[PDB]
Amino acid sequence: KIRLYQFLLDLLRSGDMKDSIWWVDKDKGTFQFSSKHKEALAHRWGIQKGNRKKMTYQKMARALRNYGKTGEVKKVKKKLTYQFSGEVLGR
DNA sequence: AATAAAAGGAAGTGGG
DNA sequence: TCCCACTTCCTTTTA
């Protein structure tokens, strides 16, 4: 199955949920979720995965934080903002 | 208080 | 066996 970081990168490239997520600085790989519309994006992630429970933004961000150690996605010190690694952006 | 973002330990689930 | 890549649950902290 698709990995969470790839699902988010794919959405940013397609623009299909432009009111839920957007690039802040695409050259740096920084992106930001919508305060009011992030839950719809989280719901889509859970459905794509076929998870038993409804996915929430809180649970999706819990998964996002696990990428901090390996580097694929890191939290930025700005509201609802994260950053992909150069490796993820290049791949 | 009400609301929200951010955090992570711990245990459960999937598919190797 | 036992790690993958999350998911689920619960609690805490800060603004």
For A37-73, give the secondary structure using H, E and C.
CHHHHHHHHHHHHCCCCCCCHHHHHHHHHHHHHHCCE
Dist. CA A36–CA A27, nearest whole Å: 25
* Resolution, Å (one decimal): 1.5
A75 labelled binding-site residue:
yes
According to the entry, how was the structure determined?
X-ray
CB-CB neighbours of A41 under 10 Å: 21
For the CA of A89 and the C1' of C15, the distance in angstroms is 33
Cα separation of A23 and A19, whole Å? Answer: 11
A49 assigned binding-site residue: yes
Distance, in Å, from the CA atom of A76 to the CA atom of A72, rounded to the nearest integer, reads 13
Compute CA distances A41 → A23, A27, A70, A90, whole Å.
Answer: 15, 23, 24, 24
